[PDB]
Amino acid sequence: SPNPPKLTKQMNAIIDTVINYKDSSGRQLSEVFIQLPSRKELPEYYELIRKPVDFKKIKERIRNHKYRSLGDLEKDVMLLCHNAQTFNLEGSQIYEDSIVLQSVFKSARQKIA
């Protein structure tokens, strides 16, 4: 099992849709989640978050064929949104952002596979 091209294209498309998504207001919800903060700017995050992941890492994993399925991919997206729900205050915009991105990923997953 190496990963067929179509799987890899699918994932990229899905994760591309999540990243480029904008709300009605025109805003791109993912922007903050693309890169993990520095251990200098936000050391508490890395005390508080067991397994840190950003959208850059997810793309690394797709490119390097490390997800064996769409469901392995999804498990890293939900970790991302979960890390974001853990660290950020409930009802904060980042917290709410992560929940919509969960949703956007699921929709993308059906419109694409």
Ligand SMILES: CC1(C)c2cc(C3CCNCC3)ccc2-n2c1nc(=O)c1c(Br)cccc12
């Ligand atoms: C909102 C917060 C804490 C954050 C702040 C900053 C900056 C802003 C400007 N001043 C310094 C810090 C950067 C990155 C992130 N970030 C955050 N929460 C996440 O959940 C998260 C995830 Br899953 C993946 C990647 C980054 C994340």
Ligand SMILES: [Zn+2]
């Ligand atoms: Zn390859």
